[PDB]
Symmetry: C3
Subunit: 389 residues, 3 copies
């Protein structure tokens, strides 16, 4: 039901969940200790319930952004690897799995937006953000346009918002700083400034969302979109000749897109911690391990320095990786959830004219901190009340 | 409300804008840039409504205390005055036009509380409290009190409470230690302890606010009262031979009144800021720039050193200026509103005899420091829930102790 | 009223209150000062409301934690014994009577938890928890049990949880750092992890409460229980042959129980301030004074010399020994809320339905919130009760 003498891995239904059980068998063929990968529905939500009673999986596969829940909630064993092993991945990926200093997951793959352009329309794409109105008046003449991506979401509008100085919090020494909301600076100010120009300079429409936009790339009706690897197959179907690259540097400085690291945390309740350790280190995080997990469902950039260079032959993959190095690791705290919506509102207020540049960002910042007290206070009410009962 | 090639100023409609509008033409005369000056009822309320959409006036006049609200709201521009021009203004005012680094406005006119006596009654004032008892009893033999002032207002009583070591928050570099309130302390402890004693020693009363106290002074029923420049009109009308001078000291320290400095800021959204920095830096802050503005309706004292001297000849002004230089450049930070009211509680219960000095003040920490979060938190809740089994119930009431 | 030159003391009915009234005799004698000890009702509710109006006793006896609530609400006079005196009582007792670096009460009695154990079944006590399971084995065979105590309560359990590194709020420099809580740290985990291992390995009994605990010992059906100086009364009564000793250590590291301190404080309003310290330090603190108090109701164990005459009693001896190795019950407001969430942790961690560092981090998270909800709530109250009382007065009086 729960336990011991074998591993019960969890990974989201849509991942290389077979390609992993392929590896999980390579394991059984060497140790004599069985592996059982499962993929239940709401599997990111079930976890805490069953870990609260101390049951479920020995290990958990998921984006790092969620474990800061589990790890805080107390549901992750602080894993210790070896330095000469921690040197087999990439430097930053280990940062996506810190908590209080305590490493709590093994990174697997990477997730980041990259510039996606039409090969049949652009040579050779824009080196920077600064000359994209110049590129656009050329193509708005052909019936087309230069670029189109979502504006009803930070995650997309963030890479540009950051670029020049704007952060979210301050990761310091394995330590996120929740009283340092990196939005109300000239870096994130002049980022957002630049953007809402091409909105009112008519290089982009205000109500441009994920679907309406996406579709228009292919087509080829718009010349560029900013999107992540999870999009490719739709474009692949359109035939539409496309390439992928490092995002347009802004003010000379590289863009800062969020980084989503597929992780594999080991359960605090797991009695098989050793076995899992071995499984992940000796078998999964080998090349041919991720040669088996990619080959079911592509992983984008992987964490293994080792087995990134073999996948790097693919141009589309190398750009993802470079981007995710010039990227900015997505935070994993509670405050995150709450931060999102303020900026989600800030940009939606700036894009519309409801407010301006310097205003909406103040409105998030101070807010962000204040609103957080409400979310934190409510947590007590829920925890308090419940108990009393 | 724009563009572009002209500025639009707003100023309170009791302030001498005619003098400011008189700069309008004399400035418009040398540059061509037409200037229209407006007194829009509720501007200090209205301004954010418009400022935060890409509008408003181009530059704004108001007390520095409300300029915190604006700067945080990212509404005012960081202005960088060339460049040893700061030396042509009083050093302390620049600690009313600053926000976590950002020098957020141009300070014009210093207001502040002062000591006004009845020259015709008590010819030469006390420079200390202590002898106020001695004085009430002295004049009582003529059927008049000695001092009477708004007890009901901390703003008016704070000077005293603070005198010995009390403070709002610890300022020290465009920065206040928001957590560190100074109403706890041993300074303020002994401060109010005096004021309290004054009431029960029969010297003065509890029901002593503006109305009663102005009536009482303006008829010559008391020797001295504590008031700002605003009352000046009314005592002139009630034909008294009055005199404003520096506030009585207590326990050997100057009284720390509350310094409010009229500042002029610039809409951070406005297309033409460079003009305000020629208008304000080059024209409005002159001798006959401020002069004219003052000459409509008196500014109070002035943040400028030069025309301060010219005005300092009138003692009343010189006293106001001096009082400010003994005071605390009133915190513009937003939990100041919470600070306020939670002493207006403390000083009353202590005054009524319902509580003691040491009790109230201490509890004041609870008045401010939690109402601070509740004030801003209660505001955030709406903004979030406003624009944008099935759980345990909503407050605004949460739960009781056990 | 409020006194005026006479000493009204306020001790609780169950403390040495006739014996204290006796020291009000040698004091008066050669100082000529009228002294009334009177034992009121729930004086930790009466005091803060008479204190508020400058009324009440000139002197209040009581545990220091409620004294927190008072010193906090600015109700108590900072007092000074000299450095020559300071060195008179034990140092650790000083770190209990210190709000914001300001020394606010005089300590007279310590109240710590003990290993209270039956000599007839276990004539040499366990010095370690580690063996406690392996001991139950031998005891179960004899028809009896090894150890019982109220699990449905932190105050008892904490001492073990506290063992390896578990603290409430981090004591550092005269003030208990409120943000630094230490229920999560690995040390505490270990502390509870052991208690749960005991409760699920059936050495313990889940719904073991106080009655079930001491009564199973006072009847003589378990080798040991964990209690304090209050319980002695009855163990004696049933003739149970007992000693009391130092509790057991965990990882060679010693058990760490909460120290409570029966303390005398001085009303900040109290008109007759100077008399009090002359009364206390020079007449009460004295050996015979304390003896006299004790000579009515035993105070248990706090004066570093007079201690010895009592300490001849081994059971009192251990209470001290224990309390020296112990954490002190801190006095600020966050404490009360802490107790609620630490209860949670233990109580359902015992139930398997929360495991384990789970219940033990969610506590650290309840604490952070049940904290700044508790403060915020008590402001909102203190407001809507002095904005109302105001209107009522504004309307009541006004009207006609
Ligand atoms: Ca299953
Ligand atoms: Ca190794
Ligand atoms: Ca107009
Ligand atoms: Ca009585
Ligand atoms: Ca003796
Ligand atoms: Zn499924
Ligand atoms: Zn353009
Ligand atoms: Zn291969
Ligand atoms: Zn008007
Ligand atoms: Zn007197
Ligand atoms: Zn002149
Ligand atoms: Zn002149
Ligand atoms: Zn066992």
């Amino acid at each position: 039901k729960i336990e011991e003498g074998k591993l019960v891995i969890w990974i989201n239904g849509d991942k290389g969940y077979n390609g992993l059980a392929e590896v999980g068998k390579k394991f059984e063929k060497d140790t004599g200790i069985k592996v059982t990968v499962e993929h239940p529905d709401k599997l990111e939500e079930k976890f805490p319930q069953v870990a609260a009673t101390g049951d479920g999986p020995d290990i958990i596969f998921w984006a790092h952004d969620r474990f800061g829940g589990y790890a805080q909630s107390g549901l992750l064993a602080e894993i210790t690897p070896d330095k000469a092993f921690q040197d087999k991945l990439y430097p930053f990926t280990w940062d996506a799995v810190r908590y209080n200093g305590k490493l709590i997951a093994y990174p697997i793959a990477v997730e980041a937006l990259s510039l996606i352009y039409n090969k049949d329309l652009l040579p050779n794409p824009p080196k920077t953000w600064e000359e994209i109105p110049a590129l656009d008046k050329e193509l708005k003449a052909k019936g087309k346009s230069a670029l189109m991506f979502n504006l009803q979401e930070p995650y997309f509008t963030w890479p540009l918002i950051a670029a020049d100085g704007g952060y979210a919090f301050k990761y310091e020494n394995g330590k996120y700083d929740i009283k340092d909301v990196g939005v109300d600076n000239a870096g994130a100010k002049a980022g957002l400034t630049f953007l809402v120009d091409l909105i009112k300079n008519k290089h982009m429409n205000a109500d441009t969302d994920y679907s309406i936009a996406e579709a228009a790339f292919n087509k080829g009706e718009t010349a560029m979109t900013i999107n992540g690897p999870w999009a490719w197959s739709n474009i692949d179907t359109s035939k539409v000749n496309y390439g992928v690259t490092v995002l347009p540097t802004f003010k000379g400085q590289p863009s800062k897109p969020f980084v989503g690291v597929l992780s594999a945390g080991i359960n605090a309740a797991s009695p098989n911690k050793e076995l899992a350790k071995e499984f992940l280190e000796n078998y999964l995080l080998t090349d041919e391990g991720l040669e088996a997990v990619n080959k079911d469902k592509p992983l984008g950039a992987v964490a293994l320095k080792s087995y990134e260079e073999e996948l790097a032959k693919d141009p589309r993959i190398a750009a993802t990786m470079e981007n995710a190095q010039k990227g900015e690791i997505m935070p994993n705290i509670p405050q995150m959830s709450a931060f999102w919506y303020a900026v989600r509102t800030a940009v939606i207020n700036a894009a519309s004219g409801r407010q301006t540049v310097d205003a909406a960002l103040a409105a998030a910042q101070t807010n962000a901190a204040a609103m957080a007290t409400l979310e934190k206070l409510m947590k007590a009410f829920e925890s308090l009340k419940s108990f009393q009962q």
